[PDB]
Design a protein around this ligand. Structure first.
Ligand SMILES: COc1ccc2c(c1)O[C@@H](O[C@@H]1O[C@H](CO)[C@@H](O)[C@H](O)[C@H]1O)C(=O)N2O
Length: 490
């Protein structure tokens, strides 16, 4: 849909800029109980109540990347990708979650083999330590990130990070402690659509015996205390001049719904609760003012020693960006009371503006609307407000819908011109943002592979490479992957 002169070229970007693709462990690996790996929260979730995954599926196999990793690397290599973002499975390294439980030599060997193979193919590993797959042994012991002591999860996570640094840090120069913290907390413990599926009594989820106005914030502050300890560890013993550590935030761009100053206020509260929640702690050592004023006692306080450790705890940062929303003011009044942690923004997040028209063209699935300007907005915030740190777009993509009711022919799934156009426009926005002074240094397409998309299961294909599950998870390059190959190698 873009004109030939508006199509991004690789020479639009500095030679040290990084293009890559991304996955996560639970979503692609399979081999859930093989070679000494312990159960995760998502394993027990999918399997004690398969009715809570939309299509009744799980990731026992996924894309079978534990066995098929050589082909993943082959595909990355063919496409000329500079880098690959994958995560390490906590229960695969440490089946009981703990130093007690001991290190699983086969887990270590897997990621060691993946890493060496990527590097010998000139592909830089960007390693996410944790992508939502908490060892089930830790969930039963103390609730995982719901840990009320705010110490046990912190120590256990830190030791896991230690193991990763100790076994992979010679070769891995780019670490991310967490990925998508706002989605993990808000969806797992707020709406409870994600494992372990907890929400306030009354709401529709597997375990409605939590608190959607509190538990997301509890899990969130444990995440922050854990990243701060791991970075503290990393800086003391493992940081070298050419290595970097950070974390990756999910963020939906925010635009004022109408012309009123109230909606500008709503917009700012929405950036704050989505981006600011986890960003502002790692930048300055505390949550956004707005969240503290609105969540109040539901948002725990950091101790002074914790603030020091948190502030400046990154060398780089990731942004996971898919879409944007219009933010519309809600007043404080006796006519309104927050139900979900995200309602503490006092702003409704609308797809359609005042003219009835969507913010951008719909990309196929329930929630992605194409709005590359919001990516630009986000980058200008990071630039002008939060010190312009080194930024990677660690996720960007769309999901093609493919279900029993409405199956997607393989020819149409491979002819993914919607995805291709979406990717091109967003890469073009990075060009525009760099020119404006953004310190963005790379871009990762979300989903190297069609994979298990959490609640959506296999109903959404986010891959630039198709995975044929009817066969033996055979990979086929889509048009998007073919364009990326041309782009990277020209
Ligand atoms: C049930 O539908 C929803 C509701 C809310 C969210 C999502 C789906 O997607 C969430 O998380 C993304 O999922 C992909 C993989 O599934 C991750 O790789 C990506 O990093 C996540 O952002 C999300 O955006 N929701 O809050």
């Amino acid at each position: 849909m873009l004109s030939p002169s508006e199509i991004p070229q690789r020479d639009w970007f500095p030679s040290d800029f990084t293009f890559g693709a991304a996955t996560s462990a639970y979503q692609i690996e399979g081999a859930w109980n093989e070679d000494g790996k312990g159960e995760s929260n998502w394993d027990h979730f999918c399997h004690n109540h398969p009715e809570r995954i939309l299509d009744g599926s799980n990731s026992d196999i996924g894309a079978n990347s534990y066995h098929m990793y050589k082909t993943d690397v082959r595909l990355l290599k063919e496409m000329g990708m500079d880098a690959y973002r994958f995560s390490i499975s906590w229960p695969r390294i440490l089946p009981k979650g703990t130093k007690e439980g001991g290190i699983n030599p086969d887990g270590i060997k897997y990621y060691r083999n993946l890493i060496n193979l990527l590097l010998e193919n000139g592909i830089e590993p960007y390693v996410t330590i944790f992508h939502w797959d908490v060892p089930q042994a830790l969930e039963e012991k103390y609730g995982g990130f719901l840990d009320k002591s705010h110490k046990s999860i912190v120590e256990d996570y830190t030791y896991f990070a230690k193991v990763c640094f100790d076994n992979f840090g010679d070769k891995v120069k780019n670490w991310l402690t967490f990925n998508d913290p706002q989605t993990f907390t808000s969806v797992s413990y707020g709406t409870g659509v994600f494992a372990p599926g907890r929400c306030s009594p009354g709401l529709d989820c597997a375990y409605p015996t939590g608190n959607s106005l509190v538990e997301p914030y509890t899990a969130g502050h444990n995440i922050l205390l854990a990243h701060a300890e791991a970075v503290d560890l990393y800086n003391k013993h493992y940081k070298r001049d050419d290595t970097r550590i950070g974390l990756a935030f999910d963020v939906m761009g925010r635009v004022p719904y109408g012309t009123s100053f109230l909606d500008k206020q709503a917009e700012e509260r929405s950036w704050d609760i989505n981006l600011g929640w986890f960003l502002e702690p790692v930048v300055r050592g505390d949550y956004p003012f707005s969240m503290r004023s609105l969540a109040r006692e539901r948002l725990p306080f950091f101790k002074d020693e914790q603030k020091e450790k948190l502030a400046g705890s990154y060398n780089m940062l990731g942004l996971n960006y898919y879409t944007s929303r219009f933010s519309k003011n809600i007043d404080i009044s006796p006519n309104y009371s927050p139900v979900l942690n995200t309602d503490d923004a006092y702003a409704s997040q609308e797809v359609n503006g005042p003219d009835g028209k969507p913010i951008g063209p719909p990309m196929g699935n329930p929630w992605i609307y194409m709005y590359p300007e919001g990516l630009k907005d986000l980058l200008m915030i990071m630039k002008n407000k939060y010190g312009n740190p080194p930024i990677y777009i660690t996720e960007n993509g769309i999901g093609d819908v493919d279900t029993k009711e409405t199956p997607l022919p393989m020819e149409a799934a491979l002819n993914d011109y919607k995805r291709l156009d979406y990717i091109q426009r967003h890469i073009a926005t990075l060009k525009e943002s760099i020119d404006l002074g953004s310190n963005v240094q790379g871009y990762f397409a979300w989903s190297l592979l069609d994979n298990f998309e959490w609640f959506a299961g296999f109903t959404e294909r986010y891959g630039i490479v198709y995975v044929d599950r009817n066969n033996n998870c055979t990979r086929y390059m889509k048009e998007s992957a073919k364009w990326l190959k041309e782009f990277n190698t020209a």
